[PDB]
Write a protein that binds this ligand. Sequence first.
Ligand SMILES: *C/C=C(C)/C=C/C=C(C)/C=C/C1=C(C)CCCC1(C)C
Length: 213
Amino acid sequence: SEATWLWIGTIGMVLGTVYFAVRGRGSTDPEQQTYYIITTLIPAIAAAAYLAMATGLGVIIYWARYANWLLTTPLLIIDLALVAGARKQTLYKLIIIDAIMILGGLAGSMMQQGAVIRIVWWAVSTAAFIILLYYLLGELSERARSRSAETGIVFNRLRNITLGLWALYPIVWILGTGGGFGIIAVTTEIMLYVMLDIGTKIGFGAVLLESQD
Ligand SMILES: *C/C=C(C)/C=C/C=C(C)/C=C/C1=C(C)CCCC1(C)C
């Protein structure tokens, strides 16, 4: 099930990338084309990472996983901020916090001395997640609603998908082998990550690009 699910994820991300690329080839408006560039760059990086995983590279430590996360999550955050009309400084705060969360996940997964400081890293990354959640529910949502009612609705949709899917990643991590106590197998963890990435990238981007009229 290892290579099976890696290739499932590779094909899913490649299909999402080519669909987002061919869906935006007819557009000259700067805002829409920026949205399309970022929204197609996310699953393209995801597909590159999954191809590296399934080709025997990507694992030494699942470095390609954290590469995919560290590269795509800030682009998802940039899309969220563009939709919300957020201040540049708030966007910088969100990017720093998200990078800290993902790097803390990578650390806690990479440590070996026991389950103590690994779970401490898990708690630090989860606190980064909580403050990210508070920023998305507070400042970004308020800004999106102050833009317009339609903008508030679209950002509500996108924010709900984002938070609901992101909150599952630390669960898979603390239950998974690569990060926590190995309660679920490596293949089950890879399947769950594949499905979560399919959601958080393809479906989120489909909503965001459909919502441009
Ligand atoms: C396309 C990939 C995405 C959207 C990945 C998102 C991943 C996360 C939000 C992961 C978060 C983590 C924590 C909140 C704590 C435990 C460590 C992580 C890295 C699994």
